[PDB]
Symmetry: C2
Subunit: 205 residues, 2 copies
């Protein structure tokens, strides 16, 4: 097999999947591929450059539906859920993403389709452009937080808040559970609805 960018990225993604981001060093990479450092660099560049490629390669997993009449909110949700699923299937991938702009080949194609869908809901240019950005940021941040629970810290945070003097901190005592605790699924759906409802509001008539 000739060394290629795509072979390097497949191998890199496999290490990441089975061992996590910290295990993906260029030294480890070169060693797995049975190649030298110079070849590695020539094909993918430095570590951050390689991670840009590994991010783009997994974006094929995100499906943006073709717009349908009267289904805009559900379809935008379906797209955000597809992005969530991508992160949940690749450990530490949200760590790579939380940082980056999805402008590689698959990212471009996906952004074109995303913007098609968003504009189709009647969103003005700035709203469609910024709303795609906000939704992507939201999804990535939530996936990162879920991955961060994969304990008791959140539980000690609960006891602390619950035992505050209720006369001085009535809201923190009362909301002690929701503030510390929320299920990943429920917070994702809540945040997704909030952003979608607010985009619709901005769209107006």
């Amino acid at each position: 097999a000739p060394l290629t960018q795509d072979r390097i990225v497949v191998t890199a993604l496999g290490i990441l999947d089975a061992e996590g981001l910290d295990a993906l060093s260029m030294r480890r990479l070169a060693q797995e591929l049975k190649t030298g450092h110079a070849s590695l660099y020539a094909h993918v560049g430095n570590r951050d450059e390689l991670l840009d490629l590994v991010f783009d390669i997994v974006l094929t997993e995100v499906e943006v539906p073709e717009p349908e009449p009267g289904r805009w909110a559900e379809q935008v949700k379906e797209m955000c859920r597809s992005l969530r699923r991508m992160f949940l299937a690749h450990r530490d991938l949200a760590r790579i993403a939380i940082d980056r702009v999805p402008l590689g080949p698959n990212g471009m194609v996906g952004m074109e389709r995303t913007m098609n869908l968003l504009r189709s809901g009647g969103l003005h240019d700035e709203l469609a452009a910024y709303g795609g950005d906000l939704l992507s940021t939201f999804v990535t941040a939530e996936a990162l937080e879920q991955s961060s629970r994969n304990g008791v810290f959140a539980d000690q945070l609960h006891g602390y808040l619950k035992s505050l003097p209720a006369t001085s901190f009535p809201n923190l005592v009362h909301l002690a559970g929701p503030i510390t605790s929320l299920d990943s699924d429920r917070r994702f759906e809540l945040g997704l609805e909030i952003i979608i409802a607010g985009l619709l509001a901005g769209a107006g008539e």
Copy 2:
């Protein structure tokens, strides 16, 4: 001259280093040098570098003003409180970097959170929406800040020029939206995202009721 060290004098000095020189310049050694004290008395007062940063984070939160609820002005008061948080980050180099992984539950943080939740609930938000909304608002403000600081006028005109000169037959939306996707000034992005989240919160409180 030299007064016994207090926690406050130490933190204020640390924040000064951060403001002028950034987070990497702020080591315990630099801090002890700047205070002209020994490392025992520094550590007795503020612990390790991570504990110090928890303290620097809480001290600047004094700057965030969360208003007492005013009936009929809910949406603009939430904006106001969010703009105050943004102001604070913009004032303090590298501060969103410290904030991003931290829960603001020191003194200033906990009071700020109480007042925030007071304001959110005063708008008729049910418990989960109030609690989650507070989080989503702080998360959004902090992310924006991290990135107003992570920006440059070159890179955007490159990305703009890539998008703008894409085959219009292939990428009609990317070509047409090259400006917004690439341009958006910070103020504009900030206000749009604020509008969006506040409308969605009211929308959620309104179905509720």
